[PDB]
Design an enzyme around this catalytic site. Structure first.
Site, PDB file in Angstrom:
ATOM      1  N   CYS A 147       1.115  -1.224   0.062  1.00 51.72           N
ATOM      2  CA  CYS A 147       0.056   0.068  -0.042  1.00 51.72           C
ATOM      3  C   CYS A 147       0.833   1.175  -0.035  1.00 51.72           C
ATOM      4  O   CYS A 147       1.001   1.979   0.960  1.00 51.72           O
ATOM      5  CB  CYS A 147      -0.895  -0.005   1.264  1.00 51.72           C
ATOM      6  SG  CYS A 147      -2.333   1.212   0.980  1.00 51.72           S
ATOM      7  N   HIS A 179      -9.744   3.256   0.292  1.00 55.89           N
ATOM      8  CA  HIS A 179      -9.086   2.402   0.785  1.00 55.89           C
ATOM      9  C   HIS A 179      -8.645   2.578   2.215  1.00 55.89           C
ATOM     10  O   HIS A 179      -7.435   1.883   2.733  1.00 55.89           O
ATOM     11  CB  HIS A 179      -8.086   1.750  -0.178  1.00 55.89           C
ATOM     12  CG  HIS A 179      -7.589   0.518   0.276  1.00 55.89           C
ATOM     13  ND1 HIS A 179      -5.953   0.479   0.384  1.00 55.89           N
ATOM     14  CD2 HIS A 179      -7.905  -0.742   0.098  1.00 55.89           C
ATOM     15  CE1 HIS A 179      -5.751  -0.995   0.415  1.00 55.89           C
ATOM     16  NE2 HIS A 179      -6.824  -1.536   0.620  1.00 55.89           N
ATOM     17  N   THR A 207     -18.981   1.721  12.386  1.00 59.13           N
ATOM     18  CA  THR A 207     -18.544   3.195  11.986  1.00 59.13           C
ATOM     19  C   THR A 207     -18.748   2.987  10.242  1.00 59.13           C
ATOM     20  O   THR A 207     -18.985   3.991   9.648  1.00 59.13           O
ATOM     21  CB  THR A 207     -17.342   3.463  12.192  1.00 59.13           C
ATOM     22  OG1 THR A 207     -17.561   3.726  13.674  1.00 59.13           O
ATOM     23  CG2 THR A 207     -16.705   4.515  11.670  1.00 59.13           C
ATOM     24  N   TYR A 235     -28.706  13.179  13.301  1.00 61.50           N
ATOM     25  CA  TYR A 235     -27.960  12.102  13.935  1.00 61.50           C
ATOM     26  C   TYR A 235     -28.928  10.852  14.228  1.00 61.50           C
ATOM     27  O   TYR A 235     -28.410   9.770  13.903  1.00 61.50           O
ATOM     28  CB  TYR A 235     -27.275  12.650  15.265  1.00 61.50           C
ATOM     29  CG  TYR A 235     -26.221  13.661  15.114  1.00 61.50           C
ATOM     30  CD1 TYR A 235     -24.979  13.199  14.887  1.00 61.50           C
ATOM     31  CD2 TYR A 235     -26.796  15.081  15.420  1.00 61.50           C
ATOM     32  CE1 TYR A 235     -24.088  14.445  14.795  1.00 61.50           C
ATOM     33  CE2 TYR A 235     -25.842  16.035  15.228  1.00 61.50           C
ATOM     34  CZ  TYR A 235     -24.498  15.770  14.859  1.00 61.50           C
ATOM     35  OH  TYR A 235     -23.521  16.920  14.921  1.00 61.50           O
ATOM     36  N   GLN A 236     -30.079  11.328  14.529  1.00 60.67           N
ATOM     37  CA  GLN A 236     -30.930  10.026  14.813  1.00 60.67           C
ATOM     38  C   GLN A 236     -31.336   9.334  13.553  1.00 60.67           C
ATOM     39  O   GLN A 236     -31.628   8.140  13.643  1.00 60.67           O
ATOM     40  CB  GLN A 236     -32.354  10.708  15.531  1.00 60.67           C
ATOM     41  CG  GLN A 236     -32.071  11.294  16.886  1.00 60.67           C
ATOM     42  CD  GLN A 236     -31.667  12.835  17.083  1.00 60.67           C
ATOM     43  OE1 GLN A 236     -31.241  13.407  15.859  1.00 60.67           O
ATOM     44  NE2 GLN A 236     -32.195  13.440  17.904  1.00 60.67           N
ATOM     45  N   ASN A 273     -30.050   1.022  13.511  1.00 60.65           N
ATOM     46  CA  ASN A 273     -30.263   1.156  15.011  1.00 60.65           C
ATOM     47  C   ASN A 273     -30.644   2.613  15.640  1.00 60.65           C
ATOM     48  O   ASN A 273     -29.604   3.518  15.548  1.00 60.65           O
ATOM     49  CB  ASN A 273     -28.886   0.700  16.005  1.00 60.65           C
ATOM     50  CG  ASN A 273     -29.267   0.759  17.543  1.00 60.65           C
ATOM     51  OD1 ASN A 273     -30.282   1.093  17.981  1.00 60.65           O
ATOM     52  ND2 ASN A 273     -28.262   0.399  18.041  1.00 60.65           N
ATOM     53  N   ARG A 305     -25.679   8.715  19.217  1.00 64.28           N
ATOM     54  CA  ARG A 305     -24.293   9.085  19.810  1.00 64.28           C
ATOM     55  C   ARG A 305     -23.079   8.267  19.398  1.00 64.28           C
ATOM     56  O   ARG A 305     -22.277   8.866  18.907  1.00 64.28           O
ATOM     57  CB  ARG A 305     -23.998   8.630  21.588  1.00 64.28           C
ATOM     58  CG  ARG A 305     -22.956   9.350  22.107  1.00 64.28           C
ATOM     59  CD  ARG A 305     -22.937   9.122  23.581  1.00 64.28           C
ATOM     60  NE  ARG A 305     -23.066   7.891  24.174  1.00 64.28           N
ATOM     61  CZ  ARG A 305     -23.496   7.713  25.452  1.00 64.28           C
ATOM     62  NH1 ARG A 305     -23.873   8.615  26.193  1.00 64.28           N
ATOM     63  NH2 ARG A 305     -23.919   6.406  25.827  1.00 64.28           N
ATOM     64  N   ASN A 342     -14.337   9.770  10.249  1.00 65.66           N
ATOM     65  CA  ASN A 342     -14.454   9.950   8.763  1.00 65.66           C
ATOM     66  C   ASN A 342     -13.036  10.517   8.330  1.00 65.66           C
ATOM     67  O   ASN A 342     -12.765  11.589   8.654  1.00 65.66           O
ATOM     68  CB  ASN A 342     -15.548  10.785   8.345  1.00 65.66           C
ATOM     69  CG  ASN A 342     -15.677  11.097   7.032  1.00 65.66           C
ATOM     70  OD1 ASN A 342     -15.010  10.272   6.064  1.00 65.66           O
ATOM     71  ND2 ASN A 342     -16.279  12.141   6.534  1.00 65.66           N
ATOM     72  N   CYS A 353     -19.972  14.350   6.261  1.00 63.07           N
ATOM     73  CA  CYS A 353     -20.263  14.621   7.662  1.00 63.07           C
ATOM     74  C   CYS A 353     -20.795  15.882   7.982  1.00 63.07           C
ATOM     75  O   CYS A 353     -21.419  16.057   9.004  1.00 63.07           O
ATOM     76  CB  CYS A 353     -18.969  14.097   8.379  1.00 63.07           C
ATOM     77  SG  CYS A 353     -17.603  15.093   7.935  1.00 63.07           S
ATOM     78  N   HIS A 354     -20.497  16.756   7.157  1.00 64.28           N
ATOM     79  CA  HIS A 354     -20.840  18.214   7.567  1.00 64.28           C
ATOM     80  C   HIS A 354     -22.619  18.439   7.213  1.00 64.28           C
ATOM     81  O   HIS A 354     -23.155  19.388   7.619  1.00 64.28           O
ATOM     82  CB  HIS A 354     -20.460  19.432   6.583  1.00 64.28           C
ATOM     83  CG  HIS A 354     -20.657  19.202   4.966  1.00 64.28           C
ATOM     84  ND1 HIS A 354     -20.127  18.272   4.109  1.00 64.28           N
ATOM     85  CD2 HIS A 354     -21.693  20.053   4.316  1.00 64.28           C
ATOM     86  CE1 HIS A 354     -20.591  18.364   3.033  1.00 64.28           C
ATOM     87  NE2 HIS A 354     -21.559  19.339   3.000  1.00 64.28           N
ATOM     88  N   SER A 365     -31.479  17.558  15.235  1.00 63.96           N
ATOM     89  CA  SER A 365     -32.879  17.522  15.079  1.00 63.96           C
ATOM     90  C   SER A 365     -33.676  18.908  15.605  1.00 63.96           C
ATOM     91  O   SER A 365     -34.668  19.113  15.081  1.00 63.96           O
ATOM     92  CB  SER A 365     -33.649  16.312  15.823  1.00 63.96           C
ATOM     93  OG  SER A 365     -33.106  16.455  17.229  1.00 63.96           O
ATOM     94  N   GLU A 392     -24.125  25.138   0.386  1.00 72.10           N
ATOM     95  CA  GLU A 392     -25.033  24.350  -0.407  1.00 72.10           C
ATOM     96  C   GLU A 392     -26.629  24.694  -0.235  1.00 72.10           C
ATOM     97  O   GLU A 392     -27.613  24.210  -0.556  1.00 72.10           O
ATOM     98  CB  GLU A 392     -25.118  23.038   0.172  1.00 72.10           C
ATOM     99  CG  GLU A 392     -23.829  22.197  -0.137  1.00 72.10           C
ATOM    100  CD  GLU A 392     -23.634  20.584   0.462  1.00 72.10           C
ATOM    101  OE1 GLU A 392     -24.746  20.165   0.816  1.00 72.10           O
ATOM    102  OE2 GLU A 392     -22.463  20.384   0.801  1.00 72.10           O
TER     103      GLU A 392
HETATM  104 ZN   LIG Z   1      -4.489   1.908   0.372  1.00 71.85          ZN
END
Ligand SMILES: [Zn+2]
EC number: 2.1.1.63
Length: 162
Positions: free
Chosen positions: A1, A71, A81, A100-101, A109, A114, A123, A131-132, A137, A158
């Protein structure tokens, strides 16, 4: 790698992109459209550069750009995750947001908000995996691994009134 790297300046500051032949490993914020400091392969790196350039400077065409293979070790093995990150990547598009919920529920789940919040911090490829776009809520922007101002800039970029 064998890890290859290149840097791309942006409205958020210098972005370090690292990866190998198998895929993009990380997008790191180090703190006028710009080129990547080092041109050429591996392919996932070139694809990431084109994707980011489009995200910041030709947003109307963002969906046209292929998402590079990932990768980083977090994507190599199954985990809540990874399930979270992949779901976010697949479902939440430019201009959209998710609580998040809702993301927890999406990940299987409804009570793991959390853990979802913790997953965002794991991330390795922000922006590309949005993730932004994971917010409160309550309507509030919510915490961000890269800082509130950065999260707000991306959301404002955005169309949000921020
Ligand atoms: Zn790699």
């Amino acid at each position: 790698c064998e890890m290859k790297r290149t840097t791309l300046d942006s409205p958020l500051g210098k972005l370090e992109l690292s990866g190998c032949e198998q895929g993009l490993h990380e997008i790191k914020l180090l703190g006028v459209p710009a080129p990547a400091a080092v041109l050429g392969g591996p392919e996932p790196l070139m694809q990431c550069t084109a994707w980011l350039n489009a995200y910041f400077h030709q947003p109307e065409a963002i969906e046209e750009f292929p998402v590079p293979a990932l990768h980083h070790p977090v994507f190599q093995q199954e985990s809540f995750t990874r399930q979270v990150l992949w779901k976010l990547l697949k479902v939440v598009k430019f201009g959209e947001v998710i609580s998040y919920q809702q993301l927890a529920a999406l990940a299987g789940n409804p009570k793991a908000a959390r853990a979802v919040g913790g997953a965002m911090r794991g991330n390795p490829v922000p922006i590309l995996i949005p993730c932004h776009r994971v917010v409160c809520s309550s309507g509030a922007v919510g915490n961000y691994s890269g800082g509130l101002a950065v999260k707000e800039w991306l959301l404002a970029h955005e169309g949000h009134r921020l």
